[model samples]
Target: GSQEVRRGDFVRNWQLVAAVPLFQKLGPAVLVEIVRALRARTVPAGAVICRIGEPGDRMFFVVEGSVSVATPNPVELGPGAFFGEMALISGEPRSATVSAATTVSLLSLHSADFQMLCSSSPEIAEIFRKTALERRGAAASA
Candidate 1:
Protein backbone atom coordinates (compact mmCIF):
# COMPACT_ATOMS: atom_id res chain seq x y z
CA GLY A 1 0.00 0.00 0.00
CA SER A 2 1.94 2.98 -1.25
CA GLN A 3 0.91 6.55 -0.58
CA GLU A 4 1.92 7.43 -4.09
CA VAL A 5 -1.18 7.79 -6.20
CA ARG A 6 -1.24 5.13 -8.88
CA ARG A 7 -3.82 4.29 -11.53
CA GLY A 8 -5.42 1.95 -9.03
CA ASP A 9 -5.88 4.82 -6.62
CA PHE A 10 -8.11 6.97 -8.80
CA VAL A 11 -11.49 5.64 -7.66
CA ARG A 12 -10.77 6.08 -3.97
CA ASN A 13 -9.34 9.52 -4.57
CA TRP A 14 -12.40 10.55 -6.56
CA GLN A 15 -14.75 9.33 -3.86
CA LEU A 16 -12.76 11.08 -1.18
CA VAL A 17 -12.53 14.46 -2.90
CA ALA A 18 -15.89 14.29 -4.61
CA ALA A 19 -17.69 13.54 -1.37
CA VAL A 20 -16.52 16.88 -0.14
CA PRO A 21 -19.78 18.83 -0.50
CA LEU A 22 -17.86 22.01 -1.08
CA PHE A 23 -16.37 20.51 -4.20
CA GLN A 24 -19.31 18.40 -5.31
CA LYS A 25 -20.81 21.11 -7.46
CA LEU A 26 -17.64 22.01 -9.32
CA GLY A 27 -17.52 21.20 -13.01
CA PRO A 28 -16.80 17.59 -13.99
CA ALA A 29 -13.50 18.37 -15.71
CA VAL A 30 -12.48 20.60 -12.86
CA LEU A 31 -13.11 17.76 -10.46
CA VAL A 32 -11.14 15.33 -12.57
CA GLU A 33 -8.08 17.55 -12.75
CA ILE A 34 -8.37 18.20 -9.04
CA VAL A 35 -8.64 14.49 -8.37
CA ARG A 36 -5.67 13.93 -10.59
CA ALA A 37 -3.49 16.15 -8.46
CA LEU A 38 -4.85 15.45 -4.98
CA ARG A 39 -3.31 13.01 -2.52
CA ALA A 40 -5.11 11.04 0.13
CA ARG A 41 -4.05 10.46 3.71
CA THR A 42 -5.51 9.60 7.10
CA VAL A 43 -4.40 11.40 10.21
CA PRO A 44 -4.66 10.10 13.72
CA ALA A 45 -6.70 11.94 16.25
CA GLY A 46 -4.93 14.65 18.26
CA ALA A 47 -2.33 15.20 15.56
CA VAL A 48 -1.69 18.71 14.45
CA ILE A 49 -2.78 18.89 10.83
CA CYS A 50 -0.83 22.07 10.40
CA ARG A 51 0.78 24.46 12.82
CA ILE A 52 0.10 28.13 12.95
CA GLY A 53 2.96 30.07 11.39
CA GLU A 54 4.12 27.02 9.46
CA PRO A 55 4.94 27.61 5.83
CA GLY A 56 1.92 26.22 4.03
CA ASP A 57 2.48 24.40 0.77
CA ARG A 58 -0.80 22.49 0.68
CA MET A 59 -4.48 22.81 1.43
CA PHE A 60 -6.70 20.00 2.74
CA PHE A 61 -10.28 18.86 2.28
CA VAL A 62 -11.81 16.85 5.08
CA VAL A 63 -13.38 13.62 3.87
CA GLU A 64 -14.31 12.13 7.19
CA GLY A 65 -14.17 13.07 10.89
CA SER A 66 -13.71 16.57 12.21
CA VAL A 67 -10.91 18.93 13.20
CA SER A 68 -10.60 21.68 15.72
CA VAL A 69 -9.60 25.02 14.32
CA ALA A 70 -7.47 27.06 16.74
CA THR A 71 -9.04 30.46 16.61
CA PRO A 72 -9.61 31.00 20.37
CA ASN A 73 -13.21 29.72 20.29
CA PRO A 74 -12.10 26.30 19.06
CA VAL A 75 -14.34 25.94 16.05
CA GLU A 76 -14.70 22.39 14.79
CA LEU A 77 -15.00 21.83 11.06
CA GLY A 78 -16.53 18.60 9.85
CA PRO A 79 -16.53 16.74 6.57
CA GLY A 80 -16.60 19.06 3.52
CA ALA A 81 -14.46 21.55 5.42
CA PHE A 82 -11.18 22.86 4.08
CA PHE A 83 -8.16 24.64 5.48
CA GLY A 84 -4.84 26.28 4.59
CA GLU A 85 -6.19 28.02 1.49
CA MET A 86 -5.43 31.47 2.85
CA ALA A 87 -1.79 30.61 3.18
CA LEU A 88 -1.96 29.15 -0.27
CA ILE A 89 -3.36 32.41 -1.63
CA SER A 90 -0.99 34.69 0.24
CA GLY A 91 2.10 32.49 -0.06
CA GLU A 92 2.62 33.06 3.63
CA PRO A 93 2.63 31.09 6.85
CA ARG A 94 -0.58 29.56 8.14
CA SER A 95 -2.79 31.90 10.11
CA ALA A 96 -4.27 29.14 12.28
CA THR A 97 -3.55 25.61 13.38
CA VAL A 98 -5.86 22.65 12.67
CA SER A 99 -5.83 19.51 14.80
CA ALA A 100 -7.64 16.28 14.15
CA ALA A 101 -10.34 15.90 16.74
CA THR A 102 -10.99 12.35 15.59
CA THR A 103 -9.34 9.91 13.24
CA VAL A 104 -9.48 11.95 10.08
CA SER A 105 -9.30 11.28 6.37
CA LEU A 106 -8.27 14.01 3.96
CA LEU A 107 -7.30 14.92 0.43
CA SER A 108 -4.51 17.44 0.09
CA LEU A 109 -3.48 19.41 -2.95
CA HIS A 110 -0.07 20.98 -3.42
CA SER A 111 0.09 24.69 -3.99
CA ALA A 112 1.89 24.06 -7.24
CA ASP A 113 -1.00 22.01 -8.57
CA PHE A 114 -3.44 24.48 -7.07
CA GLN A 115 -1.83 27.38 -8.92
CA MET A 116 -2.22 25.51 -12.17
CA LEU A 117 -5.81 24.61 -11.31
CA CYS A 118 -6.57 28.25 -10.68
CA SER A 119 -5.25 29.24 -14.05
CA SER A 120 -7.12 26.50 -15.82
CA SER A 121 -10.38 26.53 -13.90
CA PRO A 122 -11.91 29.92 -13.48
CA GLU A 123 -14.83 28.53 -11.46
CA ILE A 124 -12.58 26.87 -8.95
CA ALA A 125 -10.41 29.97 -8.72
CA GLU A 126 -13.35 32.26 -8.05
CA ILE A 127 -14.66 30.17 -5.19
CA PHE A 128 -11.30 29.96 -3.47
CA ARG A 129 -10.72 33.66 -4.00
CA LYS A 130 -14.07 34.46 -2.44
CA THR A 131 -13.56 32.07 0.43
CA ALA A 132 -10.10 33.42 1.22
CA LEU A 133 -11.51 36.91 1.50
CA GLU A 134 -14.58 35.83 3.45
CA ARG A 135 -12.54 33.74 5.85
CA ARG A 136 -10.17 36.58 6.62
CA GLY A 137 -13.00 38.79 7.74
CA ALA A 138 -14.00 36.32 10.43
CA ALA A 139 -10.45 35.18 11.17
CA ALA A 140 -9.23 38.60 12.15
CA SER A 141 -12.31 39.19 14.27
CA ALA A 142 -11.51 36.07 16.27
Candidate 2:
Protein backbone atom coordinates (compact mmCIF):
# COMPACT_ATOMS: atom_id res chain seq x y z
CA GLY A 1 0.00 0.00 0.00
CA SER A 2 1.10 3.51 -0.79
CA GLN A 3 1.72 5.87 2.12
CA GLU A 4 0.65 9.49 2.31
CA VAL A 5 2.29 12.32 4.23
CA ARG A 6 0.33 13.73 7.20
CA ARG A 7 1.21 17.38 6.88
CA GLY A 8 -2.28 18.48 7.80
CA ASP A 9 -3.60 21.09 10.25
CA PHE A 10 -2.51 19.20 13.33
CA VAL A 11 1.02 18.84 12.04
CA ARG A 12 1.15 22.56 11.42
CA ASN A 13 -0.07 23.37 14.90
CA TRP A 14 3.38 23.65 16.42
CA GLN A 15 2.24 25.46 19.55
CA LEU A 16 -0.32 22.80 20.28
CA VAL A 17 2.24 20.10 19.67
CA ALA A 18 4.64 21.87 22.01
CA ALA A 19 2.06 21.76 24.75
CA VAL A 20 1.94 17.99 24.67
CA PRO A 21 4.52 16.67 27.13
CA LEU A 22 5.63 13.73 25.01
CA PHE A 23 6.29 16.03 22.06
CA GLN A 24 7.92 18.76 24.13
CA LYS A 25 11.38 17.19 24.36
CA LEU A 26 11.52 16.32 20.68
CA GLY A 27 13.39 18.36 18.10
CA PRO A 28 11.58 19.99 15.19
CA ALA A 29 12.71 17.42 12.65
CA VAL A 30 11.75 14.48 14.82
CA LEU A 31 8.51 16.12 15.81
CA VAL A 32 7.62 16.71 12.19
CA GLU A 33 8.25 13.09 11.39
CA ILE A 34 6.04 12.01 14.29
CA VAL A 35 3.38 14.46 13.20
CA ARG A 36 3.53 12.96 9.75
CA ALA A 37 2.45 9.69 11.28
CA LEU A 38 -0.53 11.19 13.09
CA ARG A 39 -4.10 11.04 11.87
CA ALA A 40 -6.53 13.79 12.83
CA ARG A 41 -9.93 12.81 14.11
CA THR A 42 -12.96 14.10 15.95
CA VAL A 43 -15.10 12.62 18.69
CA PRO A 44 -18.59 13.97 19.26
CA ALA A 45 -19.82 14.75 22.76
CA GLY A 46 -21.09 11.68 24.58
CA ALA A 47 -19.34 9.35 22.17
CA VAL A 48 -16.96 6.72 23.44
CA ILE A 49 -13.39 7.05 22.29
CA CYS A 50 -12.15 3.80 23.84
CA ARG A 51 -13.92 1.29 26.01
CA ILE A 52 -12.69 -0.73 28.96
CA GLY A 53 -11.76 -4.29 28.04
CA GLU A 54 -11.77 -3.48 24.32
CA PRO A 55 -8.77 -4.12 22.09
CA GLY A 56 -6.74 -1.00 21.38
CA ASP A 57 -4.10 -0.40 18.76
CA ARG A 58 -3.97 3.39 18.89
CA MET A 59 -3.26 6.27 21.24
CA PHE A 60 -4.91 9.67 21.16
CA PHE A 61 -3.94 13.18 22.16
CA VAL A 62 -6.61 15.76 22.80
CA VAL A 63 -6.21 18.68 20.45
CA GLU A 64 -9.32 20.46 21.65
CA GLY A 65 -12.12 20.16 24.18
CA SER A 66 -12.11 17.51 26.91
CA VAL A 67 -12.73 13.84 27.51
CA SER A 68 -13.96 11.97 30.57
CA VAL A 69 -12.16 8.95 31.93
CA ALA A 70 -15.00 6.86 33.29
CA THR A 71 -13.21 4.31 35.35
CA PRO A 72 -11.19 4.14 38.61
CA ASN A 73 -13.19 7.40 39.14
CA PRO A 74 -14.67 10.00 36.82
CA VAL A 75 -11.92 12.31 35.64
CA GLU A 76 -11.54 14.69 32.73
CA LEU A 77 -8.60 15.55 30.53
CA GLY A 78 -8.41 18.55 28.28
CA PRO A 79 -6.19 19.77 25.48
CA GLY A 80 -2.65 18.37 25.34
CA ALA A 81 -3.67 15.39 27.40
CA PHE A 82 -3.20 11.92 25.95
CA PHE A 83 -4.67 8.47 26.59
CA GLY A 84 -4.74 4.89 25.35
CA GLU A 85 -0.95 4.86 25.43
CA MET A 86 -0.86 2.26 28.17
CA ALA A 87 -2.64 -0.29 26.05
CA LEU A 88 -0.62 0.65 23.00
CA ILE A 89 2.61 0.28 24.96
CA SER A 90 1.75 -2.75 27.03
CA GLY A 91 -0.30 -4.75 24.53
CA GLU A 92 -3.09 -4.96 27.06
CA PRO A 93 -6.82 -4.42 26.85
CA ARG A 94 -8.10 -0.87 27.13
CA SER A 95 -7.83 -0.08 30.83
CA ALA A 96 -10.57 2.48 31.06
CA THR A 97 -13.45 3.92 29.10
CA VAL A 98 -12.97 7.33 27.58
CA SER A 99 -15.81 9.50 26.35
CA ALA A 100 -15.93 12.93 24.85
CA ALA A 101 -17.22 15.47 27.33
CA THR A 102 -17.60 17.89 24.47
CA THR A 103 -16.97 17.65 20.77
CA VAL A 104 -13.22 17.14 20.46
CA SER A 105 -10.48 17.18 17.88
CA LEU A 106 -7.63 14.70 18.39
CA LEU A 107 -4.46 13.39 16.81
CA SER A 108 -4.10 9.62 16.81
CA LEU A 109 -1.19 7.26 16.15
CA HIS A 110 -1.59 3.59 15.53
CA SER A 111 0.59 1.14 17.46
CA ALA A 112 2.72 0.30 14.42
CA ASP A 113 3.44 3.92 13.62
CA PHE A 114 4.22 4.62 17.27
CA GLN A 115 6.67 1.74 17.29
CA MET A 116 8.24 3.05 14.12
CA LEU A 117 8.60 6.49 15.65
CA CYS A 118 10.20 5.02 18.78
CA SER A 119 12.60 2.83 16.81
CA SER A 120 13.62 5.83 14.76
CA SER A 121 14.80 7.67 17.85
CA PRO A 122 16.17 5.78 20.81
CA GLU A 123 16.29 8.75 23.18
CA ILE A 124 12.64 9.61 22.74
CA ALA A 125 11.78 5.91 22.83
CA GLU A 126 13.50 5.53 26.20
CA ILE A 127 11.55 8.45 27.59
CA PHE A 128 8.31 6.94 26.32
CA ARG A 129 9.13 3.50 27.66
CA LYS A 130 10.02 4.80 31.10
CA THR A 131 6.90 6.93 31.27
CA ALA A 132 4.70 4.07 30.17
CA LEU A 133 6.24 1.69 32.67
CA GLU A 134 5.76 4.16 35.49
CA ARG A 135 2.17 4.86 34.52
CA ARG A 136 1.38 1.17 34.14
CA GLY A 137 2.81 0.44 37.55
CA ALA A 138 0.88 3.27 39.12
CA ALA A 139 -2.34 2.17 37.48
CA ALA A 140 -1.84 -1.37 38.62
CA SER A 141 -1.29 -0.30 42.22
CA ALA A 142 -4.17 2.17 42.26
Candidate 3:
Protein backbone atom coordinates (compact mmCIF):
# COMPACT_ATOMS: atom_id res chain seq x y z
CA GLY A 1 0.00 0.00 0.00
CA SER A 2 1.25 3.49 -0.86
CA GLN A 3 0.81 5.06 2.54
CA GLU A 4 -0.35 8.56 3.22
CA VAL A 5 1.59 9.85 6.20
CA ARG A 6 -1.07 11.77 8.05
CA ARG A 7 -3.77 9.17 7.55
CA GLY A 8 -1.53 6.16 7.91
CA ASP A 9 1.09 5.95 10.67
CA PHE A 10 0.00 9.25 12.15
CA VAL A 11 -3.60 8.17 11.98
CA ARG A 12 -2.82 4.93 13.77
CA ASN A 13 -1.43 6.98 16.62
CA TRP A 14 -4.44 9.22 16.41
CA GLN A 15 -6.75 6.24 16.63
CA LEU A 16 -4.99 4.98 19.69
CA VAL A 17 -5.12 8.38 21.32
CA ALA A 18 -8.73 8.90 20.43
CA ALA A 19 -9.74 5.48 21.75
CA VAL A 20 -8.56 6.32 25.24
CA PRO A 21 -11.62 6.96 27.40
CA LEU A 22 -9.95 10.09 28.64
CA PHE A 23 -9.85 11.39 25.10
CA GLN A 24 -12.99 9.94 23.54
CA LYS A 25 -15.22 13.00 23.65
CA LEU A 26 -12.66 15.35 22.23
CA GLY A 27 -13.55 16.01 18.58
CA PRO A 28 -11.61 14.69 15.59
CA ALA A 29 -9.92 18.04 14.86
CA VAL A 30 -8.97 18.44 18.48
CA LEU A 31 -7.69 14.90 18.56
CA VAL A 32 -5.72 15.62 15.41
CA GLU A 33 -4.16 18.62 17.11
CA ILE A 34 -3.38 16.56 20.16
CA VAL A 35 -1.87 13.81 18.05
CA ARG A 36 0.11 16.42 16.12
CA ALA A 37 1.70 17.45 19.38
CA LEU A 38 2.88 13.94 20.06
CA ARG A 39 6.16 12.30 19.22
CA ALA A 40 7.13 8.67 19.53
CA ARG A 41 9.88 7.35 21.82
CA THR A 42 11.35 4.02 22.72
CA VAL A 43 12.96 2.94 25.99
CA PRO A 44 15.19 -0.01 26.71
CA ALA A 45 14.35 -2.70 29.20
CA GLY A 46 15.46 -1.82 32.76
CA ALA A 47 15.69 1.86 31.89
CA VAL A 48 14.00 4.30 34.20
CA ILE A 49 11.53 6.34 32.22
CA CYS A 50 11.45 9.05 34.84
CA ARG A 51 12.49 9.33 38.45
CA ILE A 52 10.53 10.39 41.48
CA GLY A 53 10.74 14.11 42.30
CA GLU A 54 11.92 15.07 38.84
CA PRO A 55 10.03 17.85 37.11
CA GLY A 56 7.62 16.47 34.53
CA ASP A 57 7.59 18.12 31.12
CA ARG A 58 5.61 15.49 29.21
CA MET A 59 2.92 12.79 29.36
CA PHE A 60 3.25 9.33 27.85
CA PHE A 61 1.10 6.60 26.37
CA VAL A 62 2.46 3.16 25.87
CA VAL A 63 2.23 1.83 22.36
CA GLU A 64 4.10 -1.44 22.85
CA GLY A 65 5.82 -3.43 25.60
CA SER A 66 5.17 -2.80 29.31
CA VAL A 67 6.26 -0.72 32.29
CA SER A 68 6.48 -1.48 35.98
CA VAL A 69 6.47 1.19 38.62
CA ALA A 70 8.39 0.05 41.68
CA THR A 71 6.98 1.99 44.54
CA PRO A 72 7.14 1.49 48.27
CA ASN A 73 3.38 1.40 47.93
CA PRO A 74 3.21 -1.53 45.51
CA VAL A 75 2.55 0.09 42.14
CA GLU A 76 2.14 -1.80 38.88
CA LEU A 77 1.12 -0.23 35.60
CA GLY A 78 -0.77 -2.10 32.94
CA PRO A 79 0.08 -1.42 29.33
CA GLY A 80 -1.56 1.82 28.05
CA ALA A 81 -1.63 3.31 31.56
CA PHE A 82 0.76 6.20 32.19
CA PHE A 83 2.27 8.27 34.94
CA GLY A 84 3.62 11.87 35.18
CA GLU A 85 0.50 13.52 33.81
CA MET A 86 -0.31 15.16 37.11
CA ALA A 87 3.03 16.85 37.14
CA LEU A 88 2.63 17.78 33.52
CA ILE A 89 -0.70 19.47 34.21
CA SER A 90 -0.05 20.87 37.68
CA GLY A 91 3.58 21.82 37.18
CA GLU A 92 5.03 19.74 39.98
CA PRO A 93 7.56 17.01 40.50
CA ARG A 94 6.92 13.37 39.69
CA SER A 95 5.62 11.23 42.51
CA ALA A 96 6.72 7.89 41.12
CA THR A 97 9.51 6.28 39.13
CA VAL A 98 8.48 4.45 35.96
CA SER A 99 10.90 1.93 34.62
CA ALA A 100 10.48 -0.29 31.65
CA ALA A 101 9.32 -3.81 32.46
CA THR A 102 10.45 -4.55 28.95
CA THR A 103 11.67 -2.54 26.00
CA VAL A 104 8.84 -0.07 25.43
CA SER A 105 7.44 2.27 22.83
CA LEU A 106 5.69 5.48 23.86
CA LEU A 107 3.79 8.39 22.46
CA SER A 108 4.89 11.55 24.23
CA LEU A 109 3.33 14.99 24.42
CA HIS A 110 5.25 17.87 25.85
CA SER A 111 3.85 20.30 28.39
CA ALA A 112 4.10 23.12 25.90
CA ASP A 113 1.99 21.17 23.42
CA PHE A 114 -0.62 20.54 26.07
CA GLN A 115 -0.68 24.21 26.91
CA MET A 116 -1.06 25.16 23.28
CA LEU A 117 -3.85 22.63 22.71
CA CYS A 118 -5.75 23.73 25.77
CA SER A 119 -5.29 27.45 25.21
CA SER A 120 -6.74 27.26 21.73
CA SER A 121 -9.77 25.21 22.73
CA PRO A 122 -11.57 25.60 26.00
CA GLU A 123 -13.88 22.68 25.40
CA ILE A 124 -11.00 20.34 24.90
CA ALA A 125 -9.38 21.98 27.90
CA GLU A 126 -12.43 21.31 30.04
CA ILE A 127 -12.51 17.69 29.01
CA PHE A 128 -8.86 17.32 29.81
CA ARG A 129 -9.25 19.20 33.09
CA LYS A 130 -12.15 17.05 34.13
CA THR A 131 -10.25 13.90 33.31
CA ALA A 132 -7.22 15.19 35.21
CA LEU A 133 -9.32 15.98 38.27
CA GLU A 134 -10.95 12.61 38.16
CA ARG A 135 -7.59 10.89 37.92
CA ARG A 136 -6.32 13.01 40.82
CA GLY A 137 -9.26 12.10 42.97
CA ALA A 138 -8.82 8.44 42.15
CA ALA A 139 -5.16 8.55 42.98
CA ALA A 140 -5.77 10.40 46.21
CA SER A 141 -8.38 7.88 47.26
CA ALA A 142 -6.40 4.86 46.20
Best model per TM-score: 3
Candidate 3, residue 90: Cα displacement in angstroms equals 1.5
lDDT of 3 by residue, 31-127 (tens): 7888887877778898888887767777777767788776786565655665555665576777778888888877777878767867888987888
The number of the candidate with the highest lDDT is 1
Misplaced by over 4 Å in model 3 are: 1-12, 126-140
TM-score of 3: 0.74
C-alpha lDDT of all candidate models, in order: 0.75, 0.73, 0.73
Name the weakest run of 10 consecutive residues (lDDT summed) in model 2: 11-20
**Full ranking by TM-score:** 3, 2, 1
Candidate 1's TM-score: 0.66
TM-score of each: 0.66, 0.70, 0.74
In TM-score terms, candidate 2 sits at 0.70
Q: lDDT, candidate 2, residue 99? A: 87
Q: Flag the better candidate by lDDT, 1 or 3.
A: 1
What is the lDDT for 77 in model 3?
Answer: 65
Question: Which ranges in model 2 have alpha carbons more than 4 Å from their true place?
Answer: 1-27, 122-142
Residues 55-110, model 1: lDDT tens digits? 77787777778989888797998876777656576767877788899998777788
The parts of candidate 1 lying over 4 Å away from their true place are 1-27, 119-142
